C-alpha cells in the first residue's frame, strides 16, 4: 500500500484564503484560526507553527495520519514568512461540532447511554489503531483534542493536535500512554468524572478508595470495569494494547451494547466548575506518562 508524500506550497497563503482573527482553539505550539477559501468561499481551520525540525516532524506524522476517517484532515501546508517569522501554515478541515464532552454536557434531557459511550470509544480507538499500526504514538489524547465535524447528531468525531506525536519503532511502550488515555476517557464517559485522586462541590472519588463508586457505577457491568482496569493498568508492560482493545466485544459490538442510562451528562453539569481542573490534572499526568 502506497500513499503520496507531502507537497508543501510556497506561495502566499493569502493568495488563496481570507485569514480572519477568530481563535478556534489553542494548541501545543500555537493558535488555530478561522479562514475561508476564496474560490469556493468554504470555511477552514489554520494552524501556524514556527518552522523548525520539531514542527516539521509534527506536520509529517500528521500527514501520514490525515486520511484516517477519525483524525482531522490536512488540506494543504504552506511555507510562508508570516509576520516576520518563517512558518508552516497548516490548513485543516473545519470542525464545528465542538469538543466531545462539551456536547455531552449540553444534552437537555441528560440521557447518555452506555451504548453511546461505546460507539464514541470505538471511534477514538480506530484513530489510535490507525496510528499504532504505522508506528506512531499520539501522546496527547485528551478532551480538548477530540472534536466533532458538525453539530449534527450524526457528526463524526475527530482526533487533533500532533504536537506530541512520535515514531515508536523500537520503543514500543511509547504507545502505552495512548491506551491509558482511552481508559481515562472511557471512565469519564461512563460517570462524568476522571479516575483521579484530587469548595462547594461533591467529592466523587475519595483518596485511596475503590475506583468505581456505587452512586454512578452501580449499574455498570463487571465486564466493563475489567476493560477499564486493563486500560488503566499501572505497569505499561501489562496494560492493554490497541489490538486487544479493538477486539473486545464491548468495542467490537458497540451496536449491541446495553443502553444503560448513565450519570455522565448530569455530573458534567453539576461539576462544570471544576472541568478546567480535570483537564489540567490530565495534562499534568500525561506529561509524566509519556
Ligand atoms: C472550543 O472548541 C469548540 C469547537 O470550536 C470550533 C469551531 N470551528 C472550528 C474548530 C476547529 C478546531 C481545530 C481544528 C483542527 C485542529 C485543531 C487543534 C485545536 N483545535 C483545532 C486545539 C489543539 N490542537 C489542534 O491541533 C479544526 N476546527 C473548532
Ligand atoms: Mg482524516
Task: Report on this structure.
It comes from Homo sapiens. ATP binds at residues 24-32, 47. Its EC number is 2.7.11.1. A motif (Nuclear export signal (NES)) lies at residues 282-290. The modification Phosphothreonine is found at residue 260. With 290 residues, this protein is of the alpha+beta class. It folds into two domains: 13-94, Phosphorylase Kinase, domain 1, CATH 3.30.200.20; 95-290, Transferase(Phosphotransferase), domain 1. It contains ten helices and twelve strands. The chain has helices at residues 53-65, 100-105, 114-133, 176-191, 214-217, 222-231, 242-246, 249-252, 264-270, 275-289; strands spanning 17-27, 30-37, 43-50, 74-81, 86-92, 98-99, 112-113, 136-137, 146-148, 157-159, 166-167, 261-262. The strands form four sheets. It has a five-stranded antiparallel β-sheet with strand order 1-2-3-5-4, covered by helices on one side. The protein has a three-stranded antiparallel β-sheet with strand order 6-9-10. Strands 7-12 form a two-stranded antiparallel sheet. A hairpin with a 5-residue loop joins β2 and β3. α3 (114-133) packs antiparallel against α4 and α4 (176-191) runs antiparallel to α6. The longest helix is centred in the middle third of the chain and has 20 residues, at 114-133. The protein is globular, with a radius of gyration of 20 Å. The protein starts with 16 loop residues before the first strand and ends with a helix.
Amino acid at each position: 500500500h502506497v500513499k503520496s508524500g507531502l507537497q508543501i506550497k510556497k506561495n502566499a497563503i493569502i493568495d488563496d484564503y481570507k485569514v480572519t482573527s477568530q481563535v478556534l482553539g489553542l494548541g501545543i505550539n500555537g493558535k488555530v484560526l478561522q479562514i475561508f477559501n476564496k474560490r469556493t468561499q468554504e470555511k477552514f481551520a489554520l494552524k501556524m507553527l514556527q518552522d523548525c525540525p520539531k514542527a516539521r516532524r509534527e506536520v509529517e506524522l500528521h500527514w501520514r495520519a490525515s486520511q484516517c476517517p477519525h483524525i482531522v484532515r490536512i488540506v494543504d501546508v504552506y511555507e510562508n514568512l508570516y509576520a516576520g517569522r518563517k512558518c508552516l501554515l497548516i490548513v485543516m478541515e473545519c470542525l464545528d461540532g465542538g469538543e466531545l464532552f462539551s456536547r455531552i454536557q449540553d444534552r437537555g434531557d441528560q440521557a447518555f447511554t452506555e451504548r453511546e459511550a461505546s460507539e464514541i470509544m470505538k471511534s477514538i480507538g480506530e484513530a489510535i489503531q490507525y496510528l499504532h499500526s504505522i508506528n506512531i504514538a499520539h501522546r496527547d489524547v485528551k478532551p480538548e483534542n477530540l472534536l466533532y465535524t458538525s453539530k449534527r447528531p450524526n457528526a463524526i468525531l475527530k482526533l487533533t493536535d500532533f504536537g506530541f506525536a512520535k515514531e515508536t519503532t523500537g520503543e514500543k511502550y511509547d504507545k502505552s500512554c495512548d491506551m491509558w488515555s482511552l481508559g481515562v476517557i472511557m471512565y469519564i464517559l461512563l460517570c462524568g468524572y476522571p479516575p483521579f485522586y484530587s469548595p462547594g462541590m461533591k467529592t466523587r472519588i475519595r483518596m485511596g478508595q475503590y475506583e468505581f463508586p456505587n452512586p454512578e457505577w452501580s449499574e455498570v457491568s463487571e465486564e466493563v470495569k475489567m476493560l477499564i482496569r486493563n486500560l488503566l493498568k499501572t505497569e505499561p508492560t501489562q496494560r492493554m494494547t490497541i489490538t486487544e482493545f479493538m477486539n473486545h466485544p464491548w468495542i467490537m459490538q458497540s451496536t449491541k451494547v446495553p443502553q444503560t442510562p448513565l450519570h455522565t451528562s448530569r455530573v458534567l453539569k453539576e461539576d462544570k466548575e471544576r472541568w478546567e481542573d480535570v483537564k489540567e490534572e490530565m495534562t499534568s499526568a500525561l506529561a509524566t506518562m509519556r
